[PDB]
Amino acid sequence: SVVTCTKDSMTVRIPRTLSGFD
Amino acid sequence: GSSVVTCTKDSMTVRIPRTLSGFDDEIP
Amino acid sequence: SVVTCTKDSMTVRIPRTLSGFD
Amino acid sequence: GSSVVTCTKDSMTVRIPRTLSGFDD
Amino acid sequence: SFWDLEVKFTGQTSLLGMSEARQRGYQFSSDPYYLTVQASYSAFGLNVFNLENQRLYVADLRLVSQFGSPRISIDTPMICARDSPSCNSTHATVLIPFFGGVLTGINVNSVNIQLSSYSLQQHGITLDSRNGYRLYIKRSNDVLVLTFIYYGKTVPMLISLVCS
Amino acid sequence: FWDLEVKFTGQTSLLGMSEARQRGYQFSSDPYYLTVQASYSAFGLNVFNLENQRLYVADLRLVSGSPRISIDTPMICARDSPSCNSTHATVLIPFFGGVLTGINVNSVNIQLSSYSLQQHGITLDSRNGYRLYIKRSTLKGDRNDVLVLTFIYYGKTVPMLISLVCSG
Amino acid sequence: FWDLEVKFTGQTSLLGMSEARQRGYQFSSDPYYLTVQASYSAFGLNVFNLENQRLYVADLRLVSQFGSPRISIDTPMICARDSPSCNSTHATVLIPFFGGVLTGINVNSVNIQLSSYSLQQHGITLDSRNGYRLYIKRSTLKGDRNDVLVLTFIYYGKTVPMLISLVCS
Amino acid sequence: FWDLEVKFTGQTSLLGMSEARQRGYQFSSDPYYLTVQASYSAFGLNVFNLENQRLYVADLRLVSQFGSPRISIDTPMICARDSPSCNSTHATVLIPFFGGVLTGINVNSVNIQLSSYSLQQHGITLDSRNGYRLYIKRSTLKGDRNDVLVLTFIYYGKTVPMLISLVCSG
């Protein structure tokens, strides 16, 4: 959920399970 | 019940799998 | 420039002359 | 109306008309 | 509200919060393995077509998250022939009006007919596709799945093969 | 001449002038301004609702053509705002992807300080969208009542002018 | 699988895994995360600039190739690569106006209210004349390689938190 | 009011007026036009070579700083800097296949139909087999400072008229 910023790359990790409703 | 529309006399139902797939590094 | 909202329509007017350089 | 690239051996120049073209003349 | 329901209706899109969608006739259930979206036939934004006493309900739905960085949008269109099949004698009939969806697969009882060594006729199904899709299924539990390609989305429509 | 791009359901559709005029958009040229007009029935509108109050969003772009200009001309409009009772006129803005940065009431910028808002007779609730509770006395009670809500929406400044005449 | 759709210079383009991997993107699967990584030389990056600090913005989306559950995942990237610039007492983060509205500030897992008094108490001053100009007090930090800044923007309808180390380089 | 977007090698660089002026571009304000000039040493030019003739291509787009209306103006620059190369009675323009498709030909303010007969009526022989090569009859030119050639290109969907004086480049 956050963009990781280093001097060489931009990295984002996205959960593989979708959130429920209730 | 897997991305298929299940039609009934009163309602329509779809089931969306919660687990997302990969890209070329699990099953290329 | 600005969105005008009425009972029936949404209207926007844009100037025809392009702005300059600072 | 139009915007052309003017090319000399030393520079590249484009002039853009400031007034936008209308919807129906 | 984790997710918003996007309904395409009359050439426009309405974004509905979870509570508003429930108010307007949709239901939402969550399993460990599936997200469940249900729409009652009275739900908002449903498109209804008629061919011969058989109605096709089309919902152009998309769940759109209210989340932050991962704004996930999932197309969950629903297509249902509510009244199919009509049975008289020696024929159960399923009627699908032309609605912009492309019939790409017919599946009867876990048997994909496009991937089968037998033909549609050998499965006892007769298809007329001049004025919509008409399936004539000989009468002599069972379920039928009709797969559609609709606006780039593959929509399997499962119905039971009981006589209404 | 121009074409009308409409972002609708995740895809962008380009319409010609005639097709857009058929599908609910209008175009007009005077010496000073180009004018775009849309009904609330036009093609491609994304509508948001907050307790029966609809917020119409048109993501439109005019595209020309050696000078290939593209102009973003989005429209945001709270068609049913403000619903009124005896004491307050209430503007309900649903969350729709635009960031509220500017509030103006009858040509008076307020700078979005909750303290100065409360002092100006406005209550702003951000829990379920933007809920503006305006004092009907603070309004002139004429056709000259105005509300401008300025949003940052997809890298654009979109001032929404609505009349603070009670909903009908 | 997933394909990468890239919004670039106003146009939308779909990129396969092979093209993206050749052109500076990486795709990896974790038992818990799908990980997308972009090199600053990657295709379709837009490079804003405020003073000598660069902000790289990629408007990216993961589109499933399996159309039955057609899934679209916006994965926008906003990074101030050269931030911060430091001086004797202040570390300065310079964000140009790039389409993102600064909505939250986080320093070492502490969310700071955008009140002028709260920011000043936390040693932060914010200038909004030409981009967002953050001047961060070095004293309030907790050493070197131990401080993280998350600037949350609202970027074209997506809430994008940008995590950067507040190291002086 | 405006910024200059330089689109090079898969990325875009958003340059203020000052920084663009430092990296090789220029901007002037005129009541009638908005003018952008670039030197052949500007930052972000794509340079292509066909025989002895060089083709510079800048993928430039003016993006407004002001946000109330947001305007982006495609102003791509394409220039055959060393064109034309006369020998005695023939003026030759050579364009490498750089991804821009030849769409129009205008000589001395006269649009020409893209056909063999029409071209040679106006003194032009066009070969598109190995890049775009035009062999124009100097006898059909005025032989002045005002001989001009305009070639319209479709460049990734953009219309790009390229005005080069038809005076030998030496």
Ligand SMILES: *[C@@H]1O[C@H](CO)[C@@H](O[C@@H]2O[C@H](CO)[C@@H](O)[C@H](O)[C@H]2NC(C)=O)[C@H](O)[C@H]1NC(C)=O
């Ligand atoms: C480091 O830089 C910061 C920001 O430029 C300086 O802090 C400001 O300095 C000015 C004077 O130049 C004061 O008027 C401000 O009150 C200071 N605080 C701000 C702007 O938040 C700081 O002095 C610099 N330190 C040096 C050069 O040693």
Ligand SMILES: *[C@@H]1O[C@H](CO)[C@@H](O)[C@H](O)[C@H]1NC(C)=O
């Ligand atoms: C039942 O309907 C089928 C469908 O055309 C028809 O062929 C058949 O003759 C009908 N039989 C009776 C008894 O109605």
Ligand SMILES: *[C@@H]1O[C@H](CO)[C@@H](O)[C@H](O)[C@H]1NC(C)=O
């Ligand atoms: C009118 O609406 C405002 C909005 O919050 C409320 O505070 C007030 O009590 C209402 N007055 C009535 C219902 O008489």
Ligand SMILES: *[C@@H]1O[C@H](CO)[C@@H](O)[C@H](O)[C@H]1NC(C)=O
């Ligand atoms: C001059 O150039 C033309 C083509 O550019 C060529 O056909 C002609 O033969 C040349 N003149 C000579 C070789 O004397």
